[PDB]
mmCIF file of C-alpha atoms in Angstrom:
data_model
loop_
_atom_site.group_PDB
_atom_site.id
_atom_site.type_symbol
_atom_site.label_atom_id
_atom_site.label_comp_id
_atom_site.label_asym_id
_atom_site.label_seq_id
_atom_site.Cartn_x
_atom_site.Cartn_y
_atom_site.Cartn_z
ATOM 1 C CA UNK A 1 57.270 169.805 58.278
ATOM 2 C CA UNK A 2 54.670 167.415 59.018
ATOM 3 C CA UNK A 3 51.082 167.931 58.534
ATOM 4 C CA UNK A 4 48.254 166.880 60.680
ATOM 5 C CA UNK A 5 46.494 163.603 61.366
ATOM 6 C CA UNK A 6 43.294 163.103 60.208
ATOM 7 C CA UNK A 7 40.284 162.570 63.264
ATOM 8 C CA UNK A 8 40.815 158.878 64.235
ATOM 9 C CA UNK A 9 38.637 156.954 66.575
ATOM 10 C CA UNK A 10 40.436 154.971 68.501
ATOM 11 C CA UNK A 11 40.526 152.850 72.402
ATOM 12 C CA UNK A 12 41.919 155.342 74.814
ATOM 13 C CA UNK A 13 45.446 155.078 76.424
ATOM 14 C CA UNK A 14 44.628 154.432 80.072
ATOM 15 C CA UNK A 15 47.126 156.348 82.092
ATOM 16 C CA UNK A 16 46.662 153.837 84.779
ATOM 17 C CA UNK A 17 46.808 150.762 82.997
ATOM 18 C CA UNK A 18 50.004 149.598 81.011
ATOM 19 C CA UNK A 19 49.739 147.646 78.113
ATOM 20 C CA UNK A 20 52.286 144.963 78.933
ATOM 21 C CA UNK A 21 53.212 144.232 82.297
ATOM 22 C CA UNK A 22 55.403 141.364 81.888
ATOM 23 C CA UNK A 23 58.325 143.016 80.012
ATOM 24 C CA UNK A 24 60.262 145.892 80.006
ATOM 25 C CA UNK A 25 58.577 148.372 76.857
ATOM 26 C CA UNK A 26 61.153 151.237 77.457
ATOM 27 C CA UNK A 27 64.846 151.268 78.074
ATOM 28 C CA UNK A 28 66.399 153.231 80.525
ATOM 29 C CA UNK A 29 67.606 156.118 78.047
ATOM 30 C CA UNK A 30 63.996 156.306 77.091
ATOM 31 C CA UNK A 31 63.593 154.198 73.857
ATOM 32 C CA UNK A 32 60.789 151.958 73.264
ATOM 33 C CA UNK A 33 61.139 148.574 73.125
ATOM 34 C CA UNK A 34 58.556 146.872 70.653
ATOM 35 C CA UNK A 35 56.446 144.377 71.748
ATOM 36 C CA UNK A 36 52.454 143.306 70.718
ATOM 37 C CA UNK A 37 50.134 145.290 73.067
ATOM 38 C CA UNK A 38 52.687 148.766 72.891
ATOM 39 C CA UNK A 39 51.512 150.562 69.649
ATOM 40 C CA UNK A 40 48.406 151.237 67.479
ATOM 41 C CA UNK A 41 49.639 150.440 64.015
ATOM 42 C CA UNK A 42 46.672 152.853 62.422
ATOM 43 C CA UNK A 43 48.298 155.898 64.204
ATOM 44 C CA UNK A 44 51.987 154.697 63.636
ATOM 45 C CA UNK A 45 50.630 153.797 59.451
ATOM 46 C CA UNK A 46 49.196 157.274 59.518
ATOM 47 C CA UNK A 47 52.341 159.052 60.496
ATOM 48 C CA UNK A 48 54.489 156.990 58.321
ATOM 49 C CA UNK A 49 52.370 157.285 54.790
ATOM 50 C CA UNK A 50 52.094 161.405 55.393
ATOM 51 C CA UNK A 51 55.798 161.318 54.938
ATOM 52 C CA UNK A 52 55.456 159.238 51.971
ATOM 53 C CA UNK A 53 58.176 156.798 53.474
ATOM 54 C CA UNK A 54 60.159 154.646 51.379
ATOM 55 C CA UNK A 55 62.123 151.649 53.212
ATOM 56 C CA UNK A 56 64.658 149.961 51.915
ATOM 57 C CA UNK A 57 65.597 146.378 52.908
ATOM 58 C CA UNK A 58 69.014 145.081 52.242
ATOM 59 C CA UNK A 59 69.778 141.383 52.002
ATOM 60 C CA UNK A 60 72.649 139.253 51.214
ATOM 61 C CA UNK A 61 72.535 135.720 49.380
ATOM 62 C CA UNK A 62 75.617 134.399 48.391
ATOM 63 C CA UNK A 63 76.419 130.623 47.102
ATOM 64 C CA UNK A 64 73.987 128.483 48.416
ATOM 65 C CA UNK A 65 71.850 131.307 50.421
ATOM 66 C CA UNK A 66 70.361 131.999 47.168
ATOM 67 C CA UNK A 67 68.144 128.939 47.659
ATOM 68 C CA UNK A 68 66.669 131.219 50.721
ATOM 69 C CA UNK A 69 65.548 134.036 48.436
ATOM 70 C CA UNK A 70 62.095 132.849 46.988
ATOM 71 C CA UNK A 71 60.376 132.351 50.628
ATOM 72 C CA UNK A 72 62.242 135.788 52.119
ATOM 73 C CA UNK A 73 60.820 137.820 49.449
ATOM 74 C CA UNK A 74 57.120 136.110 49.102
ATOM 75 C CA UNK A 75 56.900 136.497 52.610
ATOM 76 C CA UNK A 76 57.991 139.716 53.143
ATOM 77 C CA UNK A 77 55.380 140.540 50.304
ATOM 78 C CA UNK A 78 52.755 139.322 52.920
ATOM 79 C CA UNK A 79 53.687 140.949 55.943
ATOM 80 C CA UNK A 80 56.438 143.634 55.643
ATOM 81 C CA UNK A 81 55.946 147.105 55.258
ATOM 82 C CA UNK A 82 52.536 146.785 53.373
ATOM 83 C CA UNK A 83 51.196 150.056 52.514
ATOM 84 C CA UNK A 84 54.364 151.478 52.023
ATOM 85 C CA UNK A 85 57.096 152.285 49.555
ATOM 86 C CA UNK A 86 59.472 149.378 49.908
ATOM 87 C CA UNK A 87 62.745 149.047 47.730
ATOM 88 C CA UNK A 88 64.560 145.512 48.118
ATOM 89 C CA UNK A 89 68.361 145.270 47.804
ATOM 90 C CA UNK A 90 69.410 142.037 46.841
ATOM 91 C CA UNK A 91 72.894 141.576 47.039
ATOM 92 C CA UNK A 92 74.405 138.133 45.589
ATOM 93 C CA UNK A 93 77.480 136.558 43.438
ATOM 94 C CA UNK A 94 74.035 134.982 41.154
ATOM 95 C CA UNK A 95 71.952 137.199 39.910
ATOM 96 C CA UNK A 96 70.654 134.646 37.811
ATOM 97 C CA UNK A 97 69.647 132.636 40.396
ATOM 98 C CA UNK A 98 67.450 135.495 42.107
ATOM 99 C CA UNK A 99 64.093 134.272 41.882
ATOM 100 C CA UNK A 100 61.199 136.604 39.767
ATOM 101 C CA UNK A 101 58.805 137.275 43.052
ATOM 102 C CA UNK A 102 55.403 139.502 42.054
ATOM 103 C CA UNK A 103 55.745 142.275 44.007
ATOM 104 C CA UNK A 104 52.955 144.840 45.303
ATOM 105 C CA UNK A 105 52.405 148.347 43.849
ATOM 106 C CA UNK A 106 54.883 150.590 45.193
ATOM 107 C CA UNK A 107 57.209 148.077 46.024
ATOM 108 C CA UNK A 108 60.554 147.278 43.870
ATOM 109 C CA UNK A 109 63.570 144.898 43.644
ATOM 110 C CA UNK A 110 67.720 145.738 42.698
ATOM 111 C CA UNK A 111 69.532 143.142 42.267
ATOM 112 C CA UNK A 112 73.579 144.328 43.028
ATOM 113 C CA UNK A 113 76.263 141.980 41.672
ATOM 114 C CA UNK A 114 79.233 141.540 44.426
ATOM 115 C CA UNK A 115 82.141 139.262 43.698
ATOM 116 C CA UNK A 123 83.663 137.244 53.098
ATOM 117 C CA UNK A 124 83.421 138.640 56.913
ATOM 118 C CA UNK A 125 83.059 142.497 56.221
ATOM 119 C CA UNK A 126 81.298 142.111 53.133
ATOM 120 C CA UNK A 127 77.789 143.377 54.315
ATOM 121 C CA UNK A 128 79.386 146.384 56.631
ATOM 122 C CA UNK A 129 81.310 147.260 54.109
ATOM 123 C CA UNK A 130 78.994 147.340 51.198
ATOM 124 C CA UNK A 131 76.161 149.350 53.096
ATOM 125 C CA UNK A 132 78.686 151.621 54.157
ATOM 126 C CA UNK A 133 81.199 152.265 51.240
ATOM 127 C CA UNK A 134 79.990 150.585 48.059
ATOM 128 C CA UNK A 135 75.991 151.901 48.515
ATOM 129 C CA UNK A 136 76.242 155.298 50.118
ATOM 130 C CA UNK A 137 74.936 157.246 47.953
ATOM 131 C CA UNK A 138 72.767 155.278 46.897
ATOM 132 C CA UNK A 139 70.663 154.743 49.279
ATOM 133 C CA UNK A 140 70.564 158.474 50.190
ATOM 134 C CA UNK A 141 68.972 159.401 47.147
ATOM 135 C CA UNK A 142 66.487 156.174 47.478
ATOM 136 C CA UNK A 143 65.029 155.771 50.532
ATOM 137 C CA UNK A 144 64.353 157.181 53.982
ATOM 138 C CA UNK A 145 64.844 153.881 56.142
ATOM 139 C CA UNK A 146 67.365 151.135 56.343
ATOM 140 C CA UNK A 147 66.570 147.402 57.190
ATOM 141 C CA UNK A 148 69.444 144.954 57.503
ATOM 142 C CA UNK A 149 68.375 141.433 57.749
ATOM 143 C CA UNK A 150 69.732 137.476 56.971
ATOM 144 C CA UNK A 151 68.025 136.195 54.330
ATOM 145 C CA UNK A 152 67.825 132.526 55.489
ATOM 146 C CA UNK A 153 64.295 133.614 57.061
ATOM 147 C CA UNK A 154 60.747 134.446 56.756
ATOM 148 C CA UNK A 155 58.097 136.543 57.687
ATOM 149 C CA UNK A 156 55.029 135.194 59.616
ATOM 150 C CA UNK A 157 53.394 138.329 61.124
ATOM 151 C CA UNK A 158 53.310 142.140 60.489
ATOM 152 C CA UNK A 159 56.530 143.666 60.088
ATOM 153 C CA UNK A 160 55.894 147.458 60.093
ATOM 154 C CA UNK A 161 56.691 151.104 60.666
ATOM 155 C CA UNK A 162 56.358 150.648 64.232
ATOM 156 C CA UNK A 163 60.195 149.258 63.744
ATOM 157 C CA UNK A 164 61.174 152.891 62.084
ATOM 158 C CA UNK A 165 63.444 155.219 63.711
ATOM 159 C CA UNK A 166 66.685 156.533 63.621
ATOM 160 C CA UNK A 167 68.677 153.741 64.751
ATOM 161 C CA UNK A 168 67.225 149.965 66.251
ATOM 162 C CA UNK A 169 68.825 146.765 67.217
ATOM 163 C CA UNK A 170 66.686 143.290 68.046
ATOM 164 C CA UNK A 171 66.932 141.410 71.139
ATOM 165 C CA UNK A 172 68.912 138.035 70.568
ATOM 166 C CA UNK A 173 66.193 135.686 70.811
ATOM 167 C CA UNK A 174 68.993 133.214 72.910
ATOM 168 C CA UNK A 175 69.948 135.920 75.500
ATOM 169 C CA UNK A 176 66.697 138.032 76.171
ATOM 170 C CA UNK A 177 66.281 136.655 79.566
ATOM 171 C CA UNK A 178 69.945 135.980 80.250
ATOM 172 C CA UNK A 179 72.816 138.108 83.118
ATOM 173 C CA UNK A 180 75.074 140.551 80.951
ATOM 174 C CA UNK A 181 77.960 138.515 81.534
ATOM 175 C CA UNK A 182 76.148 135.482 80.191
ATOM 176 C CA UNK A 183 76.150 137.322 76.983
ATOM 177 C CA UNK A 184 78.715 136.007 74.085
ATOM 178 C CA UNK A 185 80.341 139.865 73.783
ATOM 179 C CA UNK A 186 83.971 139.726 72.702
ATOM 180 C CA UNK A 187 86.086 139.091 75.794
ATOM 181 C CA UNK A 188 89.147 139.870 74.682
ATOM 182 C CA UNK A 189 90.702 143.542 74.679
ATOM 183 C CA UNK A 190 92.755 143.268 72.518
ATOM 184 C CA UNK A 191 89.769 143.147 70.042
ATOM 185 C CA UNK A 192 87.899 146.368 68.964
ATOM 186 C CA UNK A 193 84.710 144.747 69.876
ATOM 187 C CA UNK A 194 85.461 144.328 73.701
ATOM 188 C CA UNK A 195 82.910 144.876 76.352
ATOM 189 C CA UNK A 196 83.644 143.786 79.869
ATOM 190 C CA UNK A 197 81.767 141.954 82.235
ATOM 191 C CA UNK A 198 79.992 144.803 84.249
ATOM 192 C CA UNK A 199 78.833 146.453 80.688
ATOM 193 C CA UNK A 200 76.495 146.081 78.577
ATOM 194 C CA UNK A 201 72.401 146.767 78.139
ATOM 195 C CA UNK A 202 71.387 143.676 75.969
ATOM 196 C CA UNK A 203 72.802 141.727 72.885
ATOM 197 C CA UNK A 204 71.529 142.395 69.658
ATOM 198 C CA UNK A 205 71.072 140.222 67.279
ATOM 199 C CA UNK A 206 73.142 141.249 63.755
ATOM 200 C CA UNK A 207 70.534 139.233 61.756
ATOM 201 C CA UNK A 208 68.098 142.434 61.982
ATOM 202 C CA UNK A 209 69.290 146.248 62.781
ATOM 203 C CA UNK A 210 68.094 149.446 61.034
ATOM 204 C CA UNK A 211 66.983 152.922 60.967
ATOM 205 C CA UNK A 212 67.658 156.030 58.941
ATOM 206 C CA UNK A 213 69.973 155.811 56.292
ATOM 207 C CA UNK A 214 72.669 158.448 57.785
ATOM 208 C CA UNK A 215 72.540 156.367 60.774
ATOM 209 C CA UNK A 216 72.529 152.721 59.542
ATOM 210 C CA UNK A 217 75.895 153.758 57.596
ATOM 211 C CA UNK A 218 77.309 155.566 60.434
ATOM 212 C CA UNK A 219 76.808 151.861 62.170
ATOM 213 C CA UNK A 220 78.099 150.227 59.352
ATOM 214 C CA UNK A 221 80.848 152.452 58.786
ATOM 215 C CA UNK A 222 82.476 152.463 62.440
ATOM 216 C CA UNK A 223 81.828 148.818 62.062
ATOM 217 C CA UNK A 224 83.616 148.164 58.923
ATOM 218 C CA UNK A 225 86.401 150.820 60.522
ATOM 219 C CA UNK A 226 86.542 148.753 63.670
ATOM 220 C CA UNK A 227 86.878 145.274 61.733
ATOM 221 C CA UNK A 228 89.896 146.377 59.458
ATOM 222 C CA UNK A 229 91.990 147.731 63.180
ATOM 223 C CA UNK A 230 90.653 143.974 64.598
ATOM 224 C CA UNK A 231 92.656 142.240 61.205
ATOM 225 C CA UNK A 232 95.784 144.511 60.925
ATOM 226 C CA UNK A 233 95.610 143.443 64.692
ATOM 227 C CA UNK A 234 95.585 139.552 63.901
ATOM 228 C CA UNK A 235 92.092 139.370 65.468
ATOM 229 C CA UNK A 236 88.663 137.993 64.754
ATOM 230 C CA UNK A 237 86.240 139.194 66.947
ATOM 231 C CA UNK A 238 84.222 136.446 68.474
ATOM 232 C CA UNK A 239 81.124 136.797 66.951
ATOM 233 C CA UNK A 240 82.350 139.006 64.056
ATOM 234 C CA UNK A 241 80.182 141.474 62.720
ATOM 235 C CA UNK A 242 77.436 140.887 65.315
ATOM 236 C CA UNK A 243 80.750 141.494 68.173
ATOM 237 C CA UNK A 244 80.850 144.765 66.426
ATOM 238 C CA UNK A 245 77.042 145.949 66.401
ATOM 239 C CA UNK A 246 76.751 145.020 70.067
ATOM 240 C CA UNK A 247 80.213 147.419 70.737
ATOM 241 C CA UNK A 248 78.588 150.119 68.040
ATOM 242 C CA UNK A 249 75.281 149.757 70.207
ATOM 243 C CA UNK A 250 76.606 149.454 73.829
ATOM 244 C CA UNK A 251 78.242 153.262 72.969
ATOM 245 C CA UNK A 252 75.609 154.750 70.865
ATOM 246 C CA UNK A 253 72.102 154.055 71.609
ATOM 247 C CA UNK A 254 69.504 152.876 70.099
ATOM 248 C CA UNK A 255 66.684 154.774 69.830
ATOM 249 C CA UNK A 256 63.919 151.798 69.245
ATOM 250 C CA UNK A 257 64.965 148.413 70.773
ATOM 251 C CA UNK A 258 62.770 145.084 68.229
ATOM 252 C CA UNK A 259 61.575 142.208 71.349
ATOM 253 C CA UNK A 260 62.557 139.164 70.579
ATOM 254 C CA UNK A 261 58.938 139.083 68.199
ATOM 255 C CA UNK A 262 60.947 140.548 65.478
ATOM 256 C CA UNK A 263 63.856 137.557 65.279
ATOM 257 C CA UNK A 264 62.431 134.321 66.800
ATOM 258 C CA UNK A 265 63.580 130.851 66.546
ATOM 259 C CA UNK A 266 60.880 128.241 66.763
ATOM 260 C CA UNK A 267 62.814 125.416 66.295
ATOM 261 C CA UNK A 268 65.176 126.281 69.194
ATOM 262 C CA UNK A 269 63.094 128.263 71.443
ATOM 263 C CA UNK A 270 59.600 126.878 70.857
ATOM 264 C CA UNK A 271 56.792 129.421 71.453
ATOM 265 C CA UNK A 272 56.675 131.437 75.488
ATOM 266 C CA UNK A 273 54.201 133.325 76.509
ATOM 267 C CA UNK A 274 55.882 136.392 76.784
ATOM 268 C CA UNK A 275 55.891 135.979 72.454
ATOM 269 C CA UNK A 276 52.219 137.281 71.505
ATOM 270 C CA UNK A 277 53.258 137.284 67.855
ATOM 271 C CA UNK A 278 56.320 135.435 66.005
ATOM 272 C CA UNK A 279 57.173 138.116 63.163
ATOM 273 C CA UNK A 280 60.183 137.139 61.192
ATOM 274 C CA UNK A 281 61.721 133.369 61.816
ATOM 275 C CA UNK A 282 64.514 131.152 60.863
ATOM 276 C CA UNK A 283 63.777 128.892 58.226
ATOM 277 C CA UNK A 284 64.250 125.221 59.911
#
């Protein structure tokens, strides 16, 4: 049940204008696609806080990748999910070595102790089901060798999202680095495919996030007992998982950017959440 929104005043959706006409804002099995220009955060914030939403954010630093933690988590105090419930998941082999980041009101940090490939499909899937369940409405799966530069919000929400590759937005299907081979789990021919996601950053509601994770994980155990390594490994995976079961939001390239190796086009109004050079 959800209950009303408040009277908001507001610039009114033009019919006859659309927001962005230089990229594609919907897929063809009618998700959005989020770009700058597509959504009024105040409505989307409004929806989101009358459900009282809690998101978690899972993130795995292991060996050196702990180094990574202090900037991920200070930035993502800046710029992600701010207003809302937000419960971190650190998992790493130090837990010493996790770095004590002031967090906002409403906002709180695990840290889970793990003792190499399925490691984070696994763990979201088997070692954190329940959980998570019990803890939060959302899941957000992201690299931790990154930051946050812009707003990072609810508009991302949904039941299940994957991010545009930042490498292969503009790029033919069969330019894309699927696995080839079919012997793999992970194969997608040449004449398939919608877009490649980027595993760095996929999400959505907890039953769905470890349904992904789950056929994942499932699909990477056949691939060994096979004596295969899918080219791309987990990410090989997603794009399969995704390519068969849909997405219901689609994150623009905004949402995983690489300024380093991509610079800054046009088409990118905002940079959200960037590789650390």
């Amino acid at each position: 049940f959800m209950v009303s929104l408040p009277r908001m005043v507001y610039p009114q959706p033009k019919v006859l204008t659309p927001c962005r006409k230089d990229v594609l804002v919907v897929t063809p099995w009618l998700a959005p696609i989020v770009w700058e220009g597509t959504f009024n955060i105040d409505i989307l914030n409004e929806q989101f806080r009358l459900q009282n939403t809690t998101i978690g954010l899972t993130v795995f630093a292991i060996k050196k990748y702990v180094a990574f933690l202090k900037l991920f988590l200070e930035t993502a105090e800046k710029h992600f999910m701010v207003g809302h419930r937000v419960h971190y998941y650190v998992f790493t082999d130090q837990p010493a070595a996790v770095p004590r980041v002031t967090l906002g009101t409403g906002r709180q940090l695990s840290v889970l102790e793990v003792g190499v490939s399925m490691r984070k499909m696994e763990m979201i899937s088997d070692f954190c089901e329940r959980r998570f369940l019990s803890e939060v409405d959302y899941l957000v799966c992201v690299d931790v060798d990154m930051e946050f530069r812009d707003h990072v919000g609810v508009e991302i929400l949904t039941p299940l999202f994957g991010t545009l590759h930042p490498s292969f937005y503009g790029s033919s299907r069969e330019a894309f680095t699927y696995e080839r081979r079919p012997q793999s789990q992970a194969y997608i021919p040449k004449d398939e495919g919608d877009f490649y996601y980027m595993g760095a950053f996929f999400g959505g509601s907890v039953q769905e996030v470890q349904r992904l994770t789950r056929a994942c994980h499932q699909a990477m155990m056949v691939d060994q007992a096979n004596g295969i390594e899918a080219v791309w490994h987990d990410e090989s995976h997603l794009n399969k998982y995704l390519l068969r079961h849909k997405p219901t939001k689609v994150l623009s390239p905004e949402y995983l950017w690489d300024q380093q190796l991509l610079g800054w086009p046009a088409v990118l109004r905002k940079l959200r959440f960037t590789a650390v050079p």
